[model samples]
Target: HVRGANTRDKIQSVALELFIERGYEKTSMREIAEGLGITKAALYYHFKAKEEILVAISQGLGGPVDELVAWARTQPRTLETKREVLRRYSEALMGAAPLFRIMQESGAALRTLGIGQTLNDRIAAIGELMYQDGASVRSQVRISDALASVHFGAFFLSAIEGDPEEKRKALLESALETLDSSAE
Candidate 1:
């Protein structure tokens, strides 16, 4: 039998991989156990169902966002801090790339699993941090777009037929221009 921590970690990683490849609905718990060279009963010892794995994956991503939200709450609502919030969030989201993919492909599963609203709340908190006083609607939109560009860059932008590195540089360049123009 797998140890508790390792079993949970393996289940989460395998479930995310399957979700990305076969999608959440199509992927089954039996496939996950087979991939892990274990039985379904063994897998069940760690996760009662596939939705549990998704919830685990979501928590992995939301956990850092929650921390950033908490940290931002204590800081002065300044442009510098707002920029830092984006930077910090970008870093926090870096390691959760697989989970991000799962979220994109598994929206229905995510909703059924009850992880959607929490992320919306976190995004709203991040928005509040980015939209302090003296910021116009245009500026707020620009800031929001900058953060989204970072989040979407890896997935959507990767499909464009261009030099990946150059495309990334251009994406960041455009986002930064928006931020610079939005600065008070």
Candidate 2:
């Protein structure tokens, strides 16, 4: 059992690295097996297809955001709570950087794989929580833009040439500004 678990982790790690380096559509199960020095049959023991690997990766990286969603449900619907949601969400996205990169790079390739919908559902659920109080459409957009800025900054702003921590702090500041605007 321990050996099986270890092999599964190895497969997942190698597959994610390949998926990131090469586009998902371009990376095949054979390439993943070769990357891990395993046969295709051995790889199949853990994952039948590339999409299964991605689904596992998403579930693993998405756990914290899922937990945050549960926690947010218990909190009062206030701007403070919404801000806290973004804060926690930013932290979660940072941890899931590699997976987020895959999602961004793969784009339409992932749309039909069900992985996109799963992650999108989570984001939509959080958006629902943020705007649950019947805020104006403008307010909803502000909140969404705040979340998008952090998400895009985390995944898409790599070429900006600055300390990562500093960039994230600036991103958070900008997001908070937009989030705060919902109150006006």
Candidate 3:
């Protein structure tokens, strides 16, 4: 176990930067080592492979999402709890916060990466928490749309152009409205 946290953090950040810019599949150990200004020998001391770096990044980001799910699981499943879930979910995504991007923009990348299943499963767990039992198709669709408003709207609503916080508030409000309509 020859590793230094300082170097490990550097590697993950530089690797993620390159992965996002050049695609994970195209990025290589040499590129990451170069990006970090370290020799491959030094980089390999921290990570043996590029996939190892990806795993670290996924776990680093996925930790909070997992915590949110744990907190939600303890609370009663109500409209209030569901709304809170959307709020926390958005925070988790916005807090760099690029795991969402890596997940969304890299659908093809995910087809090959095993990390997607675990991350997507977390999303699925949140989705399950949002739905009520005996929900009809219409009600389910509204709930689904509400969640999407916060999830996709976090990134997709970029075209509207304004303060990110303001946009987030609007999207969160929109989500609650859609969720409420499903109460009908």
TM-score of every model?
0.74, 0.80, 0.77
Tens digits of per-residue lDDT for model 3, 72-162: 9999888888888888887876764465566556655454356666767877988889878888999999999998887677568656769
Where model 2 places Cα greater than 4 Å from the true spot, the runs are 2-6, 18-28, 34-38, 106-112
Tens digits of per-residue lDDT for model 1, 1-184: 4857887888888888878777877888888999988888888987887777777787776778789989999998777787777777766666666666666665554554356656567777787777756768888788878878866776887468898557766776676777767886
Candidate 1 has an lDDT of: 0.75
Error of 1 at 82 (Å): 1.6
Task: Candidate 3: give the clashing pairs.
Answer: none
How big is the positional error of residue 150 in model 1, measured in Å on the Cα after superposition?
A: 3.1
Candidates sorted by TM-score, descending order?
2, 3, 1
* Count of residue pairs whose backbone atoms collide, per candidate: 0, 0, 0
Candidate 1 vs 3: which has more TM-score: 3
Choose the strongest candidate by TM-score: 2
**Of 2 and 3, which scores higher on TM-score?**
2
CA lDDT for candidate 2: 0.82
